[PDB]
Every structure is written in structure tokens, then in C-alpha cells.
Design a protein around this ligand. Structure first.
Ligand SMILES: *[C@@H]1O[C@H](CO)[C@@H](O[C@@H]2O[C@H](CO)[C@@H](O[C@@H]3O[C@H](CO[C@H]4O[C@H](CO[C@H]5O[C@H](CO)[C@@H](O)[C@H](O)[C@@H]5O[C@H]5O[C@H](CO)[C@@H](O)[C@H](O)[C@@H]5O)[C@@H](O)[C@H](O[C@H]5O[C@H](CO)[C@@H](O)[C@H](O)[C@@H]5O)[C@@H]4O)[C@@H](O)[C@H](O[C@H]4O[C@H](CO)[C@@H](O)[C@H](O)[C@@H]4O[C@H]4O[C@H](CO)[C@@H](O)[C@H](O)[C@@H]4O[C@H]4O[C@H](CO)[C@@H](O)[C@H](O)[C@@H]4O)[C@@H]3O)[C@H](O)[C@H]2NC(C)=O)[C@H](O)[C@H]1NC(C)=O
Ligand SMILES: *[C@@H]1O[C@H](CO)[C@@H](O[C@@H]2O[C@H](CO)[C@@H](O[C@@H]3O[C@H](CO[C@H]4O[C@H](CO)[C@@H](O)[C@H](O[C@H]5O[C@H](CO)[C@@H](O)[C@H](O)[C@@H]5O)[C@@H]4O)[C@@H](O)[C@H](O[C@H]4O[C@H](CO)[C@@H](O)[C@H](O)[C@@H]4O[C@H]4O[C@H](CO)[C@@H](O)[C@H](O)[C@@H]4O[C@H]4O[C@H](CO)[C@@H](O)[C@H](O)[C@@H]4O)[C@@H]3O)[C@H](O)[C@H]2NC(C)=O)[C@H](O)[C@H]1NC(C)=O
Ligand SMILES: *[C@@H]1O[C@H](CO)[C@@H](O[C@@H]2O[C@H](CO)[C@@H](O[C@@H]3O[C@H](CO)[C@@H](O)[C@H](O[C@H]4O[C@H](CO)[C@@H](O)[C@H](O)[C@@H]4O[C@H]4O[C@H](CO)[C@@H](O)[C@H](O)[C@@H]4O[C@H]4O[C@H](CO)[C@@H](O)[C@H](O)[C@@H]4O)[C@@H]3O)[C@H](O)[C@H]2NC(C)=O)[C@H](O)[C@H]1NC(C)=O
Ligand SMILES: OC[C@H]1O[C@@H](OC[C@H]2O[C@@H](O)[C@H](O)[C@@H](O)[C@H]2O)[C@H](O)[C@@H](O)[C@H]1O
Ligand SMILES: *[C@@H]1O[C@H](CO)[C@@H](O)[C@H](O)[C@H]1NC(C)=O
Ligand SMILES: *[C@@H]1O[C@H](CO)[C@@H](O)[C@H](O)[C@H]1NC(C)=O
Ligand SMILES: *[C@@H]1O[C@H](CO)[C@@H](O)[C@H](O)[C@H]1NC(C)=O
Ligand SMILES: *[C@@H]1O[C@H](CO)[C@@H](O)[C@H](O)[C@H]1NC(C)=O
Ligand SMILES: *[C@@H]1O[C@H](CO)[C@@H](O)[C@H](O)[C@H]1NC(C)=O
Ligand SMILES: [Cl-]
Length: 968
């Protein structure tokens, strides 16, 4: 339409004139702000057989100050894009402005609470507020389009523009057209794709103004309830998705822009390990092959890698972790079985172009298989091949089911298995059987066992097939040649020859078999052996694999290894692999080019033997060195009181006054004399403090207050130095009405109520019209009994400078309003040399907030990827306390003792310096009159990985420097 690099028809996208199945994974650059680890994720995604990544940009992080767009350093998108290019990974860009994404404000900066107009509408006040952001971020995206040699192939304007309310004319075509035009005006020429929250047809081609180029929708069919991970409720497997696609957008490829790849988890919830159990390998093979049943051509898993809600970037209902139960864990490991299972399907689709050209039919409980207990959806191709997706009719069934099939082929319609026995489907599993499947000229008439991959080498073809344990399988090949078993035993290998074919039957075994039929070798594996196979692209012009183009796809090799294979390249007589290892691993290479004489692994020449079938074998030894980690409790901890506000000497005269008589928040009108909404004064993140001055009459009894900080928030209140009490918090409370009883006050004297409130982040804005992101934070109501409310004059603070935020390197959200934070003491090398010697393990003996500082050295060995975790103990029911931990200035843990569930906090290399000094800054807020302390505090590690990754550069860690604008 506007360029010729990326086109489409009713079946699929074309990239440079060639069909491709887009298999993508969601990865957010702002949730992993170390550029070398971004590359790691991209390489792990490519090893799945994927070819794309989808990403959000968080507006709140890059325009904290209205009018000042900053996407530099750790927020720089350019290294993220170059890393995609280096890995051979295309990109779907989704910069919002609204992104939801369990992020504070759903991506909107806190200053949108002052916008006089409906958010996500055509009100000019909202649209003008978006202009500066979109023109900058879309210009950067434009520069890296595929039209300009970049990796970016698709662009998503808005996010799930699907439901409206409250007087909004939904859907508004003027709005979506303006959003679309903003991108085009910034120079975006690539196709636009939307993500309708459900398959409702919004903004599809044919809808007139505001229509996108490719209609996409989203789907999370198993819900977000990770508490019952084995429960698959009745009817939750979609069946009508193709039907709705043809009704809603028959001219564009079938696209799910966010398909479930995990789940979010709230404060107090069951934990992300439970989420990984619900969205496990069984879920993937049943539900993802079900999407293939609808001939899905663009498929994106939200999330493929989740990362971390560091520096308060997350929304109020969620906590520090965003592991998401995804295929790649928060700490970047790929141990979960769901990673290996998904690799099998990604590789299937990477080499099966016949899938895109078949004619999908309707699902059947009869006609293909001999039992109504199975459902079979056919995708019928002519000479291009056919595909049959088999599953249990009741998709939740754990029953083992025997069956036979009738499949049409070029050689007649066959009743399979021909040579005796039956096929089996065990429990929550799904198969894609193939017919007339083309292996570069050799035609597989049929195979019941699923295809992992196939390649054409200089000296013959290889095909890799697998089945699950206990299964009997069958294939047939168009050939005059006979079948011979070249690896393994003939026992269990039955066969029959005809004039134009050979039929072969086999039982799945833990022992591999290789059979040979003319110039085709076929590997017959079990699913668990296949989990250890990889298909890196073989580079000849350099060391990078390049994008997944037909030519580079065809020039790939097959490697059996362990934990991970990243890349392969050929250079003279040298075949080079880059790979990672979590144990001593035997490596086999199939498809070694004839010009290759030596094997290098991670640059190191490695001995190899060649067996009778031309397969190179080698061994990679794993010997972790001593991983020495200091004891956190033995460090030289230094303490300073970070609530000096509750001493009578404190002088708040430099504090902003909360003296606005009219709020700019259109959602909730004032129920107090002045606005006590933090965002009216430019304070959107972290702990908020309010100070209320009054002159006592001496008749004061009680002080009531309604605090609001979002779900799981807490608040504490003092009268001068007297602790009045705390709201200790519940996930179910986003506000709370306390009543406090005051001591006997001295008539004519001045008092100050100090109030501390945990701001858990700003709310999302999912429903257009509702403006829920404007939900304020701070104090909503108060009553000083017997006195008019004008008796109290308030001041407040958030992070120092508010929207004129101090830390331009770490961004607008990282730090909140505590004294120690205002002064910048949470950064490396604070002025702690004259502080008191006290540990957070000793803690506090009265309600308050303390700040603890210490450094520690690491000297971890080069060439190892070692995930490190901070651990805060909770072996027994604790008293109510709140903890924030800054690692070299970066906040990487928020902890609520009484709500949970997170006790283990990963912190990535780059934020941590593995061969240098590191700084911990811990805040400890005790919401109890007897104080509080940490039970324990420990640095731990999980399995070290022998890695190919390059040196991880430390991000910028600005050290403490005295701040002019502070209040002291
Ligand atoms: C280095 O990197 C490696 C990756 O490259 C990494 O390896 C991976 O590790 C993870 C674990 O971290 C593996 O995932 C788990 O796998 C478990 C094992 O089952 C799988 O494998 C067996 C085959 O096992 C045999 O073969 C292997 C060799 O391949 C041997 O090592 C084994 O010892 C065993 O060998 C014997 O048998 C062989 C015969 O095959 C013999 O030849 C041999 O000589 C030996 O005698 C398969 O059979 C399994 O498939 C079956 O079950 C699955 C799912 O259950 C079905 O889908 C499938 O169709 C089959 O029926 C399977 O493939 C899994 O048990 C384990 O599953 C649990 O955890 C996940 C969450 O992590 C859940 O999704 C899942 O539901 C299970 O959760 C329950 O149980 C766990 C407890 O384990 C609880 O945590 C959880 O709360 C939940 O509890 C509930 O249900 C329970 C029911 O089980 C119940 O008991 C409870 O009470 C409760 O109600 C998980 O998937 C992964 O496979 C490895 N990947 C690879 C490629 O190897 C390695 O760890 C790294 N190393 C280090 C040090 O870091
Ligand atoms: C891949 O990435 C993943 C995400 O990054 C990562 O997963 C995370 O891994 C960390 C580190 O292991 C996990 O934190 C730990 O979790 C432990 C509690 O969970 C266990 O026990 C449950 C009991 O019902 C099991 O059900 C549960 O299994 C589940 O979770 C698995 C995740 O690994 C998942 O695979 C399974 O499928 C399953 O669903 C799990 O086994 C927790 O015990 C541990 O706490 C301690 O360890 C710390 C570090 O050593 C200590 O600092 C801390 O105090 C605890 O120590 C105590 O622990 C032991 C047992 O008591 C003792 O040996 C220790 O000495 C110590 O003992 C003290 O405390 C006792 C109190 O009970 C006391 O009685 C003792 O006398 C003594 O005082 C830690 O929090 C994290 O949960 C994982 N996150 C997620 C999202 O899954 C994974 O590791 C990565 N993998 C690789 C290879 O890199
Ligand atoms: C250290 O260890 C200690 C001691 O073991 C840990 O303390 C425990 O922490 C638990 C987790 O927070 C806590 O359980 C919670 O208690 C409250 C009751 O006061 C309860 O509300 C919680 O249950 C709901 O909330 C969680 C999410 O937090 C949901 O996952 C759960 O399914 C429940 O969901 C319902 O309520 C939500 C609240 O609004 C709803 O949004 C949700 O949809 C669902 O709605 C229903 O319930 C309402 C009630 O009927 C109803 O009106 C509504 O419409 C729906 O029916 C959860 O049980 C333990 O109490 C606590 N134990 C002790 C002894 O203190 C501590 O966490 C540990 N620390 C760390 C760091 O790990
Ligand atoms: O939780 C991860 C993402 O949730 C997405 O939104 C919700 C989801 O809910 C259901 O209505 C439906 O099954 C599905 O189609 C979706 O609309 C957001 O798009 C995303 O930003 C994350 O919040
Ligand atoms: C099989 O693939 C080759 C390309 O390697 C192609 O030339 C041939 O036409 C294909 N066969 C069919 C039936 O599509
Ligand atoms: C309470 O604190 C203020 C300073 O915040 C101080 O000037 C005032 O005298 C104190 N009132 C009493 C009764 O001690
Ligand atoms: C927004 O501006 C309109 C038009 O000038 C005005 O009528 C309305 O009262 C304003 N609302 C707020 C909250 O400032
Ligand atoms: C305040 O004044 C009332 C009389 O108006 C009296 O009954 C009450 O005891 C006084 N309260 C306190 C706390 O002194
Ligand atoms: C607190 O009281 C206010 C004022 O009536 C009310 O509107 C709000 O809903 C109450 N909050 C809770 C959590 O009960
Ligand atoms: Cl200050």
C-alpha cells in the first residue's frame, strides 16, 4: 500500500515477495534495561524457530516531564533494535500511546491527571498531550523500518480500542484515524495492525475512516487464575475464530496479536510458578496447535519474556516480578518444559510453507478419525500438502485414546495405520499429522509422527520426526528405493514396499532410530530427545544468522546439544557454534558442510569424531568455578533515620504547599478545602508524604483520614512525634478510612500531622470514557472533629522536583519522596561515613522509616551466566513492614511483609557489577508501634551457565552528589 517490502493477501504476509508465517514473542525493552541481555532474549527467541518480537514503549518512562522527550541511555530503543537485527529477529512495534500492559497509568504519565478531556478520545486536550511523544517515538521507529534496512515490519497504533462508556461515541473513527495519521506523519510507512481485545471487528478493512491495514485481535482463553493450575474449564478452547475472521476481515491474514503465553499475578496471589504450571507445555501444544487449526498467519505470545517491574514502573495490582510464567523466566533461564515444547512447533512452522497455502475446513468429530472422542480439523492443500490437527473433543480430557485415520493423499485415501496397530493420543496433547509433505522434492505421502524440521544438504536430505512415549506411528514415502535402518535396532521397525512407495511403521522409543530411503535420512525420536535439538541458521558471509528468509532458512544445520544453541557459522575449514550449557553435554551436528574440517564451540577448538553416518560428535565439559557470594548480614551496614519529619526540629518551609482550591482532575471533584491529590502537584510515584499544620484549641479529640494509594497500599500517621497508627494494607483496599485518637493538645500551640502513603502506581485506563487512570493518590477526605477542615494547612512531597525529576539516567519513576531518596543517598557512595552502625536485621523498635546502606564486592568468573537473587525471609508470620531495595541506585524490590508473595528478587548483571563494587540501599518502614526488622537478607544464585554471551557492560550508575533543590 505505501511500500513494497511488506505486503499480504488473504492467507499470509509476504516479505520481499515471499510468504512467511510470523511467529512472535512479546518482550518489553523497559523491563530489561541492559542492552547485552536484550540481545540474549532475542537469541533465545530465534532458537525457538521464531522470527519476530512485539514490544510496547512506555510513554510514562520517556516523557516524565511534559515537553521533554527522553529515550536515551537505558531507555534508548536503538540498541534494542540493533540487537533484534543482530539476532535475525523482525519487530512488531506497539508504542501506544496507551499500552495497558500492567504498567503504571497503563503507560500514560501521571501528568494526564491534569488533562481537561477524555483520555483515548478525540478531545483536543488529550490528543495534544500525545503529540510530542508520538512524533518522537514514531520517528525513531521510522528510522528502523525494513524499508530503511531495519528489522521493523509492522506497527500497532493504540491498544485494544474495543470498549467505551460514559458518553463516548464508541468506536470513534475520528480518533483512530488521528492516531493512525500521527504515525504516518512521523514517517511510518509499514502496514498498520490493530489488536481488538476480542474478535469484534473494530477498525477492520472496509470500516471507512480509522480502519487499519491488517485486522488483528487478542485471546487469553484460560484466564488469569493461576490458583488451580490443573483445571481447564469446560468450553474455554476457542472453536469459532476462523468463522469470525471470515466475517470480519476475510481479505487480510488471520492474526492474533496477543495470544496467551502466561498470566499476570497480583499482590497476595499464588505466585508466578503457579502461572507457569497453568500455561505449561500441555497448554501450549493443545491451544497453539488449535490456532494453527484456523490457519493463523501472524501469531504473537504475550509474554515470551516478562522481566521485572523495576523502579515503580508497574501498575498498582502487580508487584516487582513480571515473570508471567512465560517460556523465558524473569531471570532469563530456559529450563521450563514449555520452552522446549514451543521450540518444536516454531520449527515446524519455520519449514512448512504448504501450511500457509492450504484451504482450512471446519472441525469434525467424524470423517477423518474413527471416534467422536477426537476432533480433527483439516487444512487441505492440493499438491502443496495437507495438515490435520487432532485433539480430544473434550479439550480438557486426560484420557488415553486409540484411533485410526482416513486421510486423502496423492496415492489414494489411506486407512492409517496400514501395517497393523493403532495411533494413540495421550491426555492433553494435540498432533499435526501431514500428507503430501514436501521435503525439497521428496514427497512424504503421510506421517502420523510430527515434523520437527527437515533440511536439504549437499549430500542428501534429513527429516526429523517425533512422537510421545507409548505411541505407534507410521509414514509413507514416494520412492522406488527400499528402507534400511542405519542407526538403532530393526526390532519394532515394520515396513512394506510397493511399486511407487514404501510404508514404514515404528514405535516411539527413548533410543533414536535413523532410517534411510534413497537420499533421505529420517530421524525417529521421542519428544524428550527432540527437546534437545536445535536448528541454527548457518552464516557464510559473517557471524550473524540474518533474518528468517527462505534462502537462510534452507541453509541451516541440525544440532543436538543441551541447554541452548544460539548460532552457527562457517568460515574456511572451520564450523563454529555458539551455545550455552548447564551441564556436561554431548553435541551432535548433522549437515556438516563438506568443506568443514574442525569444530569450534564458543571460539574454542573442540575435538570431534565422525560416525558411520557422517554425524560429528563432540563433548563440552562443564566445570563451574567457585561462586563466592558475600553474606549480606555481615556487611558494614550504615543507618540514617529517613523520617526526620516527625521530630520537632524539622523545618518543612521549602516543601510545596498543597494550596490549590480547584483540582485539574476531571474524574473526582474535591471533598477537601484544597486538592491533596499528589498528581495535581507533579508527584506520581513512590512514597508520598503530607504535612498538615494547625494551631490547637485544646478541644481536639479525633482525626479521621481517607488515604488512597492503590491496591495493597499502606499508610502511617503521626502527630508531631506521637505515632497515631497505620493502615497496614490489603490487596482488597485501594483506599482506607482511619480514625485516630489524638492525645491531649496544648491550646494555642502548633502541631503537624505527618502522613506517609505507599503509592502503588497509577491505575490503567482499559475502558475508553471511564478515565480510570485519573484515579488520584493521596488524601481524599479528612475530619478534625469539632473543627472546620480549613483548620489544617497542608504541604506535600513526592520524589524531589516532581515532574522536574532529578535522576535523568534512572528515569522519572525510580525514586519516591522519602528524605534519603530526596537527598539521593540510595545511589552509589552515599555520605554514610558519620552514620550509625546498624543493620536492617536489627531494625527498628518504634514505628518509623529507616535507611540502610552498604557495599559488597563480587568477583564472579568470566564466561558464566549466573542468575543472582535477593532474598528476604518470611519463615513465620511477620509484623507489618514495607521494604524497598535499590541496587546501585536502581530500585529492584518492593516488599510487603503482610501481603506477599515475593520473597526472592532477581537482579540482572549490568545492574549488578560482577567484577566490582555494588551498593545496596534498603528502606524499612515499620507500620507497627513496636517497630520491625528483617528476619533475614541473603544473596543467592541458581545453576551457573557456561555461556557464549559477550561481556555484560555495567549500565550508568550515577553516584551520590549533593542536590541543590532539596529541602534540608
Ligand atoms: C538444564 O537445562 C535443562 C533444559 O535444557 C533442564 O531440564 C528441564 O528441567 C525441567 C524441570 O526443571 C523439566 O520439566 C519438568 O519435567 C518433569 C519430568 O517429566 C518430563 O520428562 C519425563 C521423562 O523423564 C524421564 O526422562 C528423563 C530424560 O529425558 C530423565 O531425566 C527422568 O529422570 C526420567 O527418566 C526415567 O524415565 C525414562 C523413560 O522416559 C528412562 O529412560 C530413564 O532411564 C528413567 O528411568 C516425561 O515422561 C514427562 O512427560 C510426561 O508428563 C508431562 C507433564 O507432566 C506430559 O505433558 C507428557 O505428555 C508426559 O505424560 C515430562 O516430559 C515434569 O514432571 C515436570 O512437570 C511438573 O512441573 C511443571 C512446572 O515446572 C508443571 O507444568 C507440571 O504440571 C508438573 O507440575 C507438577 O509437579 C511438580 C513437581 O515436579 C510441581 O512443582 C507442581 O506444583 C505440580 O504439582 C502437582 O502435580 C503433580 C503431578 O506431577 C503432583 O505430583 C503434585 O502433587 C501436584 O498436584 C516438569 O515439566 C524439563 O523437562 C527439562 N527439559 C529437558 C529438555 O530435559 C534442566 O533441569 C537444567 N538443569 C539444571 C540443574 O538447572
Ligand atoms: C529460572 O528462573 C526462575 C524465575 O527466576 C527461577 O525460579 C525462582 O527460583 C528461586 C530460587 O530457588 C525461587 O525462590 C525460592 O523458593 C523456595 C520456596 O519454594 C519451594 O518450596 C515449595 C514448597 O511447597 C515448592 O512447592 C516450590 O516449588 C515450586 O517453585 C519452583 C520454582 O523454582 C517451580 O519450579 C516448581 O515447579 C514449583 O512450582 C519450591 O520448591 C524457597 O524455599 C527459597 O527460599 C530459601 O532459599 C533462599 C536462598 O537459599 C533463602 O535465602 C531463603 O531463606 C530460603 O532458605 C531456606 O530454604 C531451605 C528450606 O527451608 C533451606 O535449605 C535453607 O537453608 C533455608 O532454610 C531456612 O529457612 C527455613 C524456613 O522454612 C527454616 O525452616 C530453616 O531452618 C532455615 O532457617 C526461595 O525463596 C523462586 O520462587 C522462583 N521463582 C519462580 C517465579 O518460580 C528458577 O530458579 C530459575 N532456574 C534456574 C536453574 O536458574
Ligand atoms: C509471609 O507469610 C505470611 C503468613 O503466612 C503471609 O501472610 C498471608 O498473606 C496472604 C496473601 O496476601 C493472605 O491471604 C489473603 O488474605 C485476605 C483476607 O484478609 C484475602 O482477601 C486474600 O484472598 C483474595 O485475594 C487474593 C489476591 O491477593 C486472591 O488471589 C484470592 O483468590 C482472593 O481473591 C478474592 O479477593 C480479591 C480481593 O478484592 C478479589 O479481587 C478476587 O477477585 C477474589 O474476589 C473474591 O472475594 C471477595 C471475598 O468474598 C468477594 O467479595 C469477591 O467479589 C470475590 O468472591 C488472601 O486470602 C493471608 O491472610 C496472610 N496470612 C496471615 C496469617 O497473615 C505473607 O503474605 C507472607 N509475606 C510474603 C512477602 O510472602
Ligand atoms: O494481562 C496481560 C495483558 O492483558 C491484555 O488484556 C486483556 C484480555 O482480557 C480479556 O478481555 C480477553 O480474553 C483478551 O482478549 C484480552 O482483552 C492487555 O492487552 C495487555 O496490555 C496486558 O494487560
Ligand atoms: C517442493 O519444493 C521445491 C523447492 O525445493 C519446489 O521446487 C517443488 O515444486 C516443491 N513441490 C511442491 C509439490 O510444491
Ligand atoms: C510540633 O512540631 C512543630 C514543628 O513541626 C513545632 O514547631 C511545634 O512547637 C511542635 N508542637 C508541640 C506542642 O510540641
Ligand atoms: C475544561 O475546559 C472547559 C472549556 O473551557 C471548561 O468549560 C471546563 O470547566 C474545564 N474543566 C476543568 C476541570 O478545568
Ligand atoms: C471538648 O469540648 C466538649 C464540650 O463542648 C467536652 O464535652 C469534651 O470533653 C471536650 N473534649 C476534649 C477531648 O477535651
Ligand atoms: C471511605 O469513606 C468514604 C467516604 O464515605 C467512602 O466513599 C469510601 O468508599 C470509603 N472507603 C472504604 C474502603 O470503605
Ligand atoms: Cl530533603
Amino acid at each position: 500500500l505505501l511500500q513494497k517490502y511488506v505486503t499480504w493477501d488473504d492467507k499470509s504476509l509476504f516479505i520481499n515477495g515471499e510468504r512467511i508465517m510470523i511467529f512472535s514473542g512479546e518482550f518489553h525493552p523497559f523491563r530489561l534495561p541492559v542492552k547485552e541481555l536484550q540481545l540474549d532474549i532475542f537469541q533465545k527467541v530465534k532458537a525457538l524457530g521464531f522470527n519476530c518480537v512485539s514490544f510496547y514503549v512506555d510513554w510514562a518512562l520517556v516523557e516524565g516531564k511534559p515537553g521533554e522527550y527522553r529515550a536515551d541511555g537505558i531507555f534508548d530503543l536503538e540498541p534494542f533494535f540493533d540487537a533484534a537485527s543482530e539476532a535475525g529477529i523482525y519487530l512488531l512495534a506497539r508504542p501506544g500511546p496507551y499500552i495497558n500492559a500492567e504498567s503504571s497509568g497503563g503507560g500514560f504519565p501521571g501528568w494526564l491527571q491534569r488533562v481537561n478531556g477524555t483520555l483515548r478520545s478525540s478531545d483536543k486536550a488529550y490528543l495534544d498531550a500525545t503529540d510530542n511523544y508520538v512524533s518522537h517515538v514514531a520517528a525513531t521507529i521510522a528510522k528502523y523500518q525494513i524499508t530503511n534496512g531495519g528489522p521493523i515490519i509492522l506497527y500497532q497504533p493504540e491498544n485494544e480500542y474495543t470498549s467505551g462508556c460514559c458518553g463516548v461515541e464508541f468506536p470513534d473513527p475520528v480518533y483512530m484515524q488521528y492516531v493512525e495519521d500521527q504515525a504516518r506523519n512521523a514517517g511510518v510507512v509499514i502496514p498498520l495492525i490493530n489488536n481488538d481485545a476480542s474478535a469484534s471487528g473494530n477498525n477492520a478493512p472496509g470500516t471507512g475512516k480509522g480502519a487499519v491495514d491488517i485486522y488483528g485481535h487478542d485471546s487469553y482463553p484460560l484466564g488469569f487464575d493461576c490458583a488451580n493450575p490443573t483445571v481447564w474449564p469446560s468450553g474455554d478452547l476457542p472453536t469459532n475464530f476462523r468463522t469470525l475472521h471470515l466475517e470480519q476481515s476475510p481479505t487480510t491474514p488471520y492474526a492474533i496479536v496477543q495470544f496467551q503465553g502466561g498470566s499476570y499475578d497480583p499482590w497476595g496471589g499464588p505466585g508466578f510458578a503457579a502461572c507457569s504450571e497453568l500455561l505449561n507445555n500441555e497448554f501450549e501444544r493443545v491451544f497453539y496447535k488449535n490456532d494453527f487449526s484456523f490457519q493463523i498467519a501472524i501469531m504473537n505470545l504475550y509474554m515470551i519474556f516478562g522481566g521485572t517491574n523495576w523502579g515503580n514502573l508497574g501498575y498498582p495490582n502487580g508487584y516487582t516480578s513480571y515473570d508471567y510464567g512465560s517460556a523465558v523466566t524473569e531471570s532469563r533461564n530456559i529450563t521450563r518444559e514449555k520452552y522446549s515444547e514451543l521450540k518444536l512447533l516454531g520449527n515446524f512452522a519455520k519449514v512448512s510453507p504448504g501450511y500457509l497455502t492450504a484451504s482450512p475446513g471446519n472441525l469434525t468429530t467424524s470423517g477423518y478419525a474413527d471416534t467422536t472422542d477426537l476432533t480433527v480439523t483439516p487444512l487441505l492443500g492440493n499438491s502443496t500438502g495437507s495438515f490435520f490437527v487432532v485433539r480430544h473433543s473434550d479439550y480438557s480430557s486426560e484420557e488415553s485414546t486409540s484411533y485410526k485415520l482416513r486421510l486423502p493423499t496423492s496415492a489414494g485415501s489411506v486407512t492409517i495405520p496400514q501395517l497393523g496397530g493403532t495411533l494413540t493420543l495421550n491426555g492433553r496433547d494435540s498432533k499435526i499429522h501431514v500428507t503430501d509433505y514436501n521435503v525439497s522434492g521428496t514427497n512424504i505421502i503421510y506421517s502420523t509422527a510430527e515434523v520437527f524440521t527437515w533440511k536439504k544438504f549437499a549430500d542428501g536430505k534429513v527429516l526429523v520426526l517425533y512422537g510421545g512415549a507409548g505411541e505407534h506411528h507410521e509414514l509413507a514415502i514416494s520412492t522406488k528405493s527400499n528402507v534400511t535402518v542405519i542407526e538403532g535396532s530393526e526390532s519394532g521397525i515394520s515396513s512394506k514396499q510397493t511399486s511407487s512407495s514404501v510404508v514404514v511403521g515404528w514405535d516411539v522409543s527413548t533410543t533414536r532410530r535413523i532410517i534411510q530411503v534413497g537420499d533421505l535420512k529420517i530421524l525417529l525420536l521421542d519428544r524428550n530427545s527432540a527437546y534437545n535439538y536445535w536448528v541454527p541458521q548457518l552464516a557464510t558471509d559473517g557471524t550473524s544468522p540474518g533474518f528468517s528468509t527462505p534462502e537462510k532458512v534452507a541453509s541451516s544445520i541440525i544440532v543436538k546439544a543441551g541447554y541452548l544453541v544460539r548460532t552457527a557459522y562457517l568460515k574456511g575449514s572451520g564450523l563454529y557454534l555458539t551455545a550455552d550449557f548447564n551441564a556436561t553435554t554431548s553435541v551432535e551436528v548433522i549437515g556438516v558442510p563438506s568443506t568443514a574440517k574442525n569444530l569450534f564451540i564458543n571460539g574454542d577448538k573442540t575435538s570431534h569424531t565422525v560416525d558411520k553416518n557422517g554425524i560429528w560428535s563432540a563433548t563440552v565439559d562443564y566445570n563451574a568455578p567457585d561462586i563466592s557470594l558475600p553474606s549480606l548480614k555481615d556487611l558494614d551496614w550504615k543507618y540514617v533515620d529517613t523520617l526526620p519529619e516527625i521530630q520537632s526540629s524539622y523545618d518543612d518551609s521549602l516543601w510545596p504547599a498543597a494550596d490549590l482550591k480547584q483540582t485539574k482532575n476531571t474524574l473526582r471533584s474535591l471533598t477537601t478545602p484544597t486538592s491533596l491529590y499528589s498528581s495535581d502537584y507533579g508527584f506520581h510515584t513512590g512514597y508520598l508524604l503530607y504535612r498538615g499544620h494547625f494551631t490547637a484549641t485544646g478541644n481536639e479529640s479525633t482525626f479521621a483520614i481517607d488515604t488512597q494509594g492503590g491496591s495493597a497500599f499502606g499508610s502511617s500517621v503521626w502527630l508531631n512525634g506521637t505515632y497515631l497508627g497505620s493502615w497496614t494494607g490489603l490487596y482488597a483496599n485501594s483506599d482506607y478510612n482511619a480514625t485516630y485518637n489524638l492525645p491531649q493538645l496544648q491550646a494555642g500551640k502548633t502541631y503537624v500531622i505527618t502522613v506517609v502513603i505507599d503509592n502503588m502506581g497509577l491505575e490503567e485506563n482499559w475502558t475508553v470514557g471511564e478515565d480510570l487512570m485519573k484515579t488520584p493518590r493521596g488524601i481524599l477526605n479528612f475530619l478534625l472533629a469539632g473543627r472546620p477542615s480549613s483548620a489544617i494547612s497542608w504541604k506535600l512531597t513526592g520524589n524531589l522536583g516532581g515532574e522536574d525529576y532529578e535522576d535523568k539516567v534512572r528515569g522519572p519513576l525510580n525514586e519516591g519522596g522519602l528524605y534519603a531518596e530526596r537527598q539521593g543517598f540510595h545511589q552509589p557512595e552515599p555520605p554514610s561515613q558519620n552514620w550509625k552502625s546498624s543493620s536492617p536485621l536489627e531494625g527498628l523498635s518504634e514505628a518509623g522509616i529507616g535507611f540502610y546502606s552498604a557495599s559488597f564486592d563480587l568477583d564472579l568468573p568470566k564466561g558464566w551466566d549466573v542468575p543472582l537473587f535477593l532474598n528476604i525471609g518470611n519463615s513465620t508470620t511477620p509484623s507489618p513492614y514495607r521494604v524497598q531495595v535499590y541496587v546501585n541506585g536502581y530500585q529492584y524490590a518492593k516488599y510487603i511483609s503482610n501481603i506477599g508473595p515475593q520473597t526472592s528478587f532477581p537482579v540482572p548483571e549490568g545492574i549488578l557489577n560482577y567484577r566490582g563494587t555494588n551498593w545496596l540501599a534498603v528502606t524499612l518502614w515499620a507500620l507497627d508501634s513496636a517497630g520491625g526488622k528483617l528476619e533475614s537478607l541473603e544473596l543467592s544464585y541458581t545453576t551457573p551457565v557456561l555461556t557464549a554471551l559477550g561481556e555484560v557492560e555495567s549500565v550508568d550508575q550515577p553516584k551520590y552528589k549533593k542536590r541543590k533543590g532539596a529541602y534540608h
